[PDB]
């Protein structure tokens with residue numbers, strides 16, 4: 001087809017209506033790429049960005065990674081920038097983090113040459129949450145997990 005799929009779920013192929021599944025996967029991914037990109041550029045993180053981030057997590061659950069290496073790296077880069085925003089709501093970061101962990105969970109797919117994420121932004125986040133001066137005074141109110 002248009003792209004070479006990465007890590008698609010095998011059970012989808014065995015399903016009785018499998019032939020129809022390929023068309024749905026292409027359309028849903030196409031909408032996710034356009035809408036997630038549009039939301040971040042338009043700066044609408046809560047109404048649209050979160051909704052489309054959730055749709056991609058559902059896409060991975062339903063269809064497996066099922067995307068090109070270029071798409072996989074682009075999603076991972078976008079999520080890392082969203083996860084490392086300095087003043088981001090910690091609840092909002094938790095949703096972004098779960099999608100980013102799922103994308104990077106299988107390290108066979110990416111070859112190190114494909115992805116070169118930085119470490120200093122992640123360090124700023126761990127200092128902010130793991131060792132927060134404000135939380136002891138009750139100013140921060142961080143999430144449980």
Ligand SMILES: O=P(O)(O)O[C@H]1[C@@H](OP(=O)(O)O)[C@@H](OP(=O)(O)O)[C@@H](OP(=O)(O)O)[C@@H](OP(=O)(O)O)[C@H]1OP(=O)(O)O
Pocket residue numbers: 105
């Ligand atoms: O074959 P399933 O029962 O659907 O389980 C698989 C399998 O897990 P196990 O084979 O270990 O049960 C994968 O693991 P491997 O192919 O690496 O052996 C993988 O799990 P990993 O990510 O730990 O590899 C994946 O999990 P996910 O859904 O997170 O992709 C998935 O488990 P699910 O039942 O959750 O699909």
